[PDB]
Amino acid sequence: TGPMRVFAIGNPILDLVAEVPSSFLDEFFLKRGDATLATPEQMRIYSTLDQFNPTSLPGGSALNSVRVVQKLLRKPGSAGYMGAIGDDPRGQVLKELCDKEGLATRFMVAPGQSTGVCAVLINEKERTLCTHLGACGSFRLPEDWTTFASGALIFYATAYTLTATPKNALEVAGYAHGIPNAIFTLNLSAPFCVELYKDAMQSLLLHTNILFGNEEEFAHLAKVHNLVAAEKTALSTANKEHAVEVCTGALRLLTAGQNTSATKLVVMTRGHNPVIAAEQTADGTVVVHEVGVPVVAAEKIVDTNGAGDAFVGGFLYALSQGKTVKQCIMCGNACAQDVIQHVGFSLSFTF
Numbered sequence: 607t608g609p610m611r612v613f614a615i616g617n618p619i620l621d622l623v624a625e626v627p628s629s630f631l632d633e634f635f636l637k638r639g640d641a642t643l644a645t646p647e648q649m650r651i652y653s654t655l656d657q658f659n660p661t662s663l664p665g666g667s668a669l670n671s672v673r674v675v676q677k678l679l680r681k682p683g684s685a686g687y688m689g690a691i692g693d694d695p696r697g698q699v700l701k702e703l704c705d706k707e708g709l710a711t712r713f714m715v716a717p718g719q720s721t722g723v724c725a726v727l728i729n730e731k732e733r734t735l736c737t738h739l740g741a742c743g744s745f746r747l748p749e750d751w752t753t754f755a756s757g758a759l760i761f762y763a764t765a766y767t768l769t770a771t772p773k774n775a776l777e778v779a780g781y782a783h784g785i786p787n788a789i790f791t792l793n794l795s796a797p798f799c800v801e802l803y804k805d806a807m808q809s810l811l812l813h814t815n816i817l818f819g820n821e822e823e824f825a826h827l828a829k830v831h832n833l834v835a836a837e838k839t840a841l842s843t844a845n846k847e848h849a850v851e852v853c854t855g856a857l858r859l860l861t862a863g864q865n866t867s868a869t870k871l872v873v874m875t876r877g878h879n880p881v882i883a884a885e886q887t888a889d890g891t892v893v894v895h896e897v898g899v900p901v902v903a904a905e906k907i908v909d910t911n912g913a914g915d916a917f918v919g920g921f922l923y924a925l926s927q928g929k930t931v932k933q934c935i936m937c938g939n940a941c942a943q944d945v946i947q948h949v950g951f952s953l954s955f956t957f
């Protein structure tokens with residue numbers, strides 16, 4: 607199709623969205639508002655969900671972000687994606703949902719395993735997420751992935767992909783490293799990724815051109831890599847000065863104190879507060895960016911799940927268009943704000 611502008615790896619997941627009664631959460635020992643991995647006792651939550659007529663939509667963090675890129679670029683195969691699915695009905699449902707949008711995909715099938723699934727449980731105007739990765743964990747990047755991805759200079763992985771193997775993201779980043787106009791981009795994804803994969807992520811960051819994350823992820827990064835003094839590790843990132851220090855320290859995990867012509871950028875989303883970024887410019891000096899976030903009244907916010915996925919997709923779309931860092935952040939804010947004002951993790955038809 608193409609031209610392919612962005613290539614990503616991810617955990618492909620079918621989201622099953624339904625309104626459920628409170629007894630549903632209680633019966634499954636879910637805490638309202640949390641996002642967890644299915645426990646043994648939640649084995650039957652997905653079949654049990656069928657009685658609440660859930661809707662099926664494509665999910666997975668990275669898949670949501672490249673579906674934003676593909677929607678904005680329009681041409682079939684503008685974004686490419688790989689991950690693993692099962693040899694089950696759910697895998698086919700997910701594949702067809704992605705094909706209809708024109709995304710370029712190669713889904714590796716793992717015989718006998720179930721396609722990733724996330725129950726998105728709506729109750730008391732909150733979402734409770736319960737994910738079972740299944741076949742996602744089997745993903746191993748194929749040897750010809752660079753041929754599949756031909757033409758793309760922007761690569762993306764979530765730290766959530768480290769739960770299959772860090773070797774996938776490390777291979778993608780390893781291909782981009784040292785090529786001045788190849789851009790490997792990474793999401794911190796969740797506090798647990800920062801701790802569980804500390805040493806693999808330290809290595810990965812050295813090969814990273816753009817790091818995305820939210821405040822709690824960066825707070826965890828700063829504590830695990832001692833990026834700030836102990837006295838500061840507890841400081842609110844709602845404080846600009848603290849946010850800037852954390853971003854600036856995180857940037858050193860990308861740069862290692864070296865300066866090349868390659869992109870080196872850390873972007874911290876901060877909810878309603880301005881986005882803060884630290885950039886190593888051409889000559890090595892570090893510039894801090896602060897981009898205000900247009901006000902969205904609380905009553906208009908349906909749910910903030912998927913806001914960061916959408917932010918990243920808008921940012922990478924703008925980056926493919928050669929836009930400045932501030933413009934890329936503004937496009938990410940626009941996409942995130944569309945998505946948080948309706949049900950669902952996709953851009954609206956009208957966007």
Ligand SMILES: Nc1ncnc2c1ncn2[C@@H]1O[C@H](COP(=O)(O)OP(=O)(O)CP(=O)(O)O)[C@@H](O)[C@H]1O
Pocket residue numbers: 820821875876877878881899900901902907910911912913914917938939940942943946
């Ligand atoms: N209350 C709000 N007002 C306007 N924009 C919002 C917002 N909350 C999120 N955003 C938009 O979405 C982006 C990502 O926000 P955030 O840093 O909260 O991600 P997040 O994953 O932490 C949401 P949550 O913590 O609720 O799961 C922000 O950069 C902004 O563009």
Ligand SMILES: CN(C)c1ncnc2c1ncn2[C@@H]1O[C@H](CO)[C@@H](O)[C@H]1O
Pocket residue numbers: 617619620621643664665666667668670724735737739766767769911912913915951
């Ligand atoms: C490894 N884990 C926990 C996960 N890996 C990748 N995507 C995930 C996820 N757990 C939840 N999701 C997805 O997050 C989106 C909302 O930001 C949902 O689409 C859901 O499938």
Ligand SMILES: [Cl-]
Pocket residue numbers: 615616617618666667668669764766767
């Ligand atoms: Cl993912």
Ligand code: NA
Pocket residue numbers: 865866867868886887888889890
């Ligand atoms: Na530089």
Ligand code: NA
Pocket residue numbers: 908909912945946947948949950951952
């Ligand atoms: Na939404």
